[PDB]
Design a protein around this ligand. Structure first.
Ligand code: GTP
Ligand code: MG
Ligand code: ZN
Length: 390
């Protein structure tokens, strides 16, 4: 039962390894191009612009590797006040990481990410201080288009955080474009948490219309929470479920048009975050239907993990994969140009045996480097076949 999130972890490892190799190769290639261009006994075998191109690639490949090394999956939770957003997050983390109450903050966000340490802490904006998580409920938020508070929870205690997932908790939806710009541009999945004792509201729909306008084919899940409230009323529950399904299906399929009606079955769930957290927190007869609701939450979790791991690998690693392929194609063109100029010179105007031998060594080293580029192209093609479907 391997978590689907390992797909993202393995992709991240693979592409960072390629970019480590690419920086090493381009550095070696740049030294060769530089030596060839700067040789006073050679004329226009390598050009000044060949060297400028190689040096420019060299100078930007380290930051690509560093950016890749921090890439992660992000899920953002939205919904009306008291719908259960924080409890859904806590259930997925197997602990009461986030508190309840304090629902008055109208514009500030909270994220949870993994720490390699063994103690939880938080950090506020523009600060490096590791503050006790028990101060979450005391942060003033006076002046605040709000702020982000970052919670760090030991990776050893939650597999999701170990596998590079970050979870974002939001204020109640009841300028929004500022929310999208500041928190949503790199979110891979959006989760709408709704009170199943109510009805899906237009204020929540409106926010996801804005997301859908700003982003292409966003991944959206709807969790109809507090489903324990109709336990022991199975006939009533059946009818409420039908009504919720009709409205949630129409929203995802007909209004947002982000899934077809079959796909939507894997995006709408009926759960009790309270029950799930109680079952998972370490250290009375269960309500009717408890195990069925727990299984439904576990089904959501599996489908969510599959969705976010596939989506984030494409969203976050494809552009630099395509860029690496372009860089390699250009480096090969430079090696082709150097080899061709050396061979032309050898056959057109080279005279002394020592000059001929010098040109032949330039040819040989340019081919060694070109073959290295081809091998890295093969690694990127393998990465594309494994991790980047059309
Ligand atoms: N019966 C029941 N209560 C729940 C469930 N999920 C959350 N609650 C309760 O509803 C209240 C609100 O829970 P939260 O998880 O804090 O909801 P929220 O959306 O984060 O609320 P705010 O951040 O204050 O807007 C808490 O008292 C929870 O115990 C559930 O599945 N079933
Ligand atoms: Mg909350
Ligand atoms: Zn704030």
């Amino acid at each position: 039962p391997v978590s689907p999130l390992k797909h993202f972890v393995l992709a991240k490892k693979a592409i960072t390894a390629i970019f480590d190799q690419l920086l090493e190769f381009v550095t070696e290639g740049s030294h060769f191009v530089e030596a060839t261009y700067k040789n006073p006994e050679l004329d226009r075998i390598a050009t000044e612009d060949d060297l400028v191109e190689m040096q420019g690639y060299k100078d930007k490949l380290s930051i690509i590797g560093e950016v890749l090394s921090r890439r992660h999956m992000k899920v953002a939770f939205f919904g009306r006040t008291s719908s259960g957003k924080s409890s859904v997050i806590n259930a997925m983390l197997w602990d009461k990481v986030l508190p309840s109450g304090i629902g008055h903050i109208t514009n500030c966000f909270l994220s949870v990410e993994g720490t390699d340490g063994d103690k939880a802490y938080l950090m506020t904006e523009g600060s490096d201080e590791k503050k006790s998580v028990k101060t979450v409920n005391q942060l003033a938020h006076a002046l605040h288009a709000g702020c982000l508070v970052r919670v760090f929870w030991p990776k050893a205690k939650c597999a999701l955080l170990r596998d590079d997932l970050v979870l974002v908790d939001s204020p109640g939806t009841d300028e929004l474009d500022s929310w999208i710009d500041k928190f949503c541009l790199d979110a891979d999945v959006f989760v709408l948490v709704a009170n199943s004792e109510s009805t899906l509201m237009n204020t929540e729909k409106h926010f996801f219309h804005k997301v859908n306008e700003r982003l292409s084919k966003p991944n959206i899940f709807i969790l109809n929470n507090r489903w324990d409230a109709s336990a022991s009323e199975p006939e009533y529950m059946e009818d409420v479920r039908r009504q919720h399904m009709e409205r949630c299906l129409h929203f995802l399929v007909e209004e947002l048009k982000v899934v077809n009606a079959l796909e939507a079955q894997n995006r709408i769930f009926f759960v009790s975050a309270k029950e799930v957290l109680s079952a998972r927190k370490q250290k009375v007869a269960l309500a009717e239907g408890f195990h069925a609701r727990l299984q439904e939450f576990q089904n959501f979790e599996q489908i969510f993990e599959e969705c976010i791991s596939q989506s984030a690998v494409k969203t976050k690693f494809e552009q630099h994969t395509i860029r690496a392929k372009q860089i390699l194609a250009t480096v090969k063109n430079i090696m082709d140009s150097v080899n061709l100029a050396a061979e032309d010179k050898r056959h057109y105007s080279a005279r002394l045996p020592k000059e001929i031998d010098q040109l032949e060594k330039i040819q040989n080293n340019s081919k060694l480097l070109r073959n290295k580029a081809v091998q890295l192209e093969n690694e990127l093609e393998n990465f594309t076949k494994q991790f980047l479907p059309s």
